[PDB]
């Protein structure tokens, strides 16, 4: 089958900028004076979505900052200007013969300016107690960049086991990132400790934030 | 409207069959070609088959050339993906999509259901339990208040959450899940204004439809 190989994998690109993505193919993708290679924007919990068709043709409805352009094995995807909505999954495809294929897709990162996370502590709830389980949830919600560190510590001391981390991907309005950190021990175990911390280290400042309670009150 | 609504996702045990459906609404379905293209837990889209608009013409994926039939019934605005011989490479979300109708060679796929979820697995069923997190006792008031929910031990993916029915749509972030001990887990946030709550309700909704389960955890204060 015919194989299509997009680069970069990834690209980060400042809004208001240009933003060019590429997709080969193993053998030439034409016939009858059209290409077949179309491109697909997808956005997390939804469908993709037509933007290009026959490489160069711009889907009723699109944006015309999204242009396509190639022929034979060689086509671009061109966004400009680059937008916060255009945070997304971009494929080629291509249909000129069968079995069609996807290109692995490249996935757009928007830069923009840091931004603190605000930060929420849960204790477990009584009832996942009564049930014998102790979950302490951290969120973290809207920060820039994506790679903050969590750090939980209980009675002063740092904590990694049983701590599972989870990343919203970037927000389509303020391109900020929100995760939540969740530390899960036994019942036993969350019993006789009193404080419980979650830590986040980011270079939007040089103190940590905090958010902690005490068991005990 | 166009719409092109899929059915028939569940899980299956390794070796099993399954039957999709995609009821197609608000175009001629009998002018268009037709195909069913999948999205791996990688996120990775992968053509699965497709039938032309009378459905004398099918191919399919090297992948599951031989395991699965494409047709469809045009009187009945239908297009049918039947499974056999299911593995676990075959997990996904299946989308139904339609082809558009040019001339001068094959087409793009311009519109695309929301999807039904596969997933193939030895591994049985377990419905989620689910917690709601309200603030700490000593918390300290603020104008803004988060709060969440905690969905704990399913199986297998999805399950969908959302607050007061849909109605608290901004400020709402749900997390991908984490498998925990071969179950999922996640946690879903919102933020509303403290003069809200605890004064007015909210209150999650959850669902897990391979177990049929609907809860709604109403969220109090300690
Ligand atoms: C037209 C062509 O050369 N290829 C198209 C292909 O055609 C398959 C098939 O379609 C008709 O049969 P029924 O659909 O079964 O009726 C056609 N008969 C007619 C026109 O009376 C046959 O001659 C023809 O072999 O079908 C696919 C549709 O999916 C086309 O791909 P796109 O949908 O991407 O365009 C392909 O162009
Ligand atoms: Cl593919
Ligand atoms: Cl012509």
């Known amino acids: 089958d015919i194989v299509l190989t997009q680069s970069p994998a990834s690209l980060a690109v400042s809004l208001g900028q240009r933003a060019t993505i590429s997709c080969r193919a193993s053998e030439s993708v034409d016939n009858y004076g059209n290409s077949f290679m179309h491109w697909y924007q997808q956005k997390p919990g939804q469908p993709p979505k037509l933007l290009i068709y026959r490489a160069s043709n711009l889907e009723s409805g699109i944006p015309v900052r999204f242009s396509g352009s190639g022929s034979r094995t060689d086509f671009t995807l061109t966004i400009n200007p680059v937008e916060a909505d255009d945070v997304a999954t971009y494929y080629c495809?291509?249909?000129?013969?069968?079995?069609?294929?996807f290109g692995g897709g490249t996935k757009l990162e928007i830069k923009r300016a840091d931004a603190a996370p605000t930060v929420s502590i849960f204790p477990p709830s009584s009832e996942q107690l009564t049930s014998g389980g102790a979950s302490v949830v951290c969120f973290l919600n809207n920060f820039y960049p994506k790679d903050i560190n969590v750090k939980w510590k209980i009675d002063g001391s740092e904590r990694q086991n049983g701590v599972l981390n989870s990343w919203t991907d970037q927000d389509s309005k303020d391109s900020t990132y929100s995760m939540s950190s969740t530390l899960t021990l036994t019942k036993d175990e969350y019993e006789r400790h009193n404080s419980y911390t979650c830590e986040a280290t980011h270079k939007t400042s040089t103190s940590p934030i905090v958010k902690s309670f005490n068991r005990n009150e | 409207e166009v719409k092109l609504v899929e059915s028939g996702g569940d899980l299956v045990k390794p070796g099993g069959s399954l039957k999709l459906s995609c009821a197609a609404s608000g175009f001629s379905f009998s002018s268009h070609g037709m195909s069913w293209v999948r999205q791996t837990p990688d996120k990775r889209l992968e053509w699965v088959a497709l039938?032309?608009?009378?459905?004398?013409?099918?191919y399919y994926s090297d992948s599951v050339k031989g395991r699965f039939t494409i047709s469809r019934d045009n009187a009945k605005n239908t297009l049918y993906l039947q499974m056999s011989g299911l593995r676990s490479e075959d997990t996904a979300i299946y989308y139904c999509?339609?082809?558009?109708?040019?001339?001068?060679?094959?087409?793009?796929?311009?519109?695309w259901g929301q999807g039904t979820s596969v997933t193939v697995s030895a591994a049985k069923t377990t419905p989620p339990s689910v917690y709601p997190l309200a603030p700490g006792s000593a918390a300290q008031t603020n104008s803004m208040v988060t709060l969440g929910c905690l969905v704990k031990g399913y199986f297998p993916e999805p399950v969908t959450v959302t607050w007061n029915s849909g109605s608290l749509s901004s400020g709402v972030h749900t997390f991908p899940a984490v498998l925990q001990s071969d179950l999922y887990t996640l946690s879903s946030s919102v933020t509303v204004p403290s003069s809200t709550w605890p004064s007015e309700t909210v209150t999650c909704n959850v669902a897990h439809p391979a177990s049929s389960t609907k809860v709604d955890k109403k969220i109090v204060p300690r």
């Open positions: 039938i032309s608009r009378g459905g004398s013409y099918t």
């Open positions: 495809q291509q249909s000129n013969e069968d079995p069609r294929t």
């Open positions: 999509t339609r082809h558009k109708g040019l001339r001068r060679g094959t087409n793009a796929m311009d519109y």
